[PDB]
């Protein structure tokens, strides 16, 4: 069982990751984990990727594909894998198919932009402590203040309404062809695809997945 898991930032696609891992006996893998593990391993693709990173440059599609190919060859992925957040472009999807990295299911996690905004914007932090708060799901005892110190809270640049909306626009635009690429491969019969309403409770999403995957 080889699964691709796509979704917008804050769509909470990972909320079903452990369920998928436990029902198939497969690891969760991401390009990030591949990079940090490859450089730590002192392997070849590692030293190469370490230079690009430390130089502050982007990693080439060519190098990423080679890392994915490397990872799914281990005994780890005898029963398959759960690829998270990759591919991100059509050319990447092609290079994977070129590298013989076939996939059984492509799951798309759907949460409308508006719900993600309210979900993300609500987050606050007390920086010197690292303590996390939320207006609606995890409210502090004293509104707009830390429960412990009593020092005022703070919000980060990454959770601001304009920053989030800007981040979602880019993703939708950038991923639009990829969603069509895999949706077409579905009706073509080279793989399977399925939209998923992530707005439902965790239990119902798990149910929806169990029938999609079987």
Residue numbers in the entry: 1 to 214
Paper text:
AdK catalysis, which plays a vital role in cellular energy homeostasis by catalysing the reversible magnesium-dependent formation of ADP from AMP and ATP10, is dependent on distinct ATP- and AMP-binding subdomains (ATPlid and AMPbd). The turnover rate of AdK is limited by product release, and it has been shown that the microscopic step accountable for this slow release is the re-opening of the substrate-binding subdomains. AdK populates two main structural ground states: an open substrate-free state and a closed Ap5a-bound state. The ground state structures of the P177A and Y171W variants in their apo- and Ap5a-bound states were determined by X-ray crystallography.
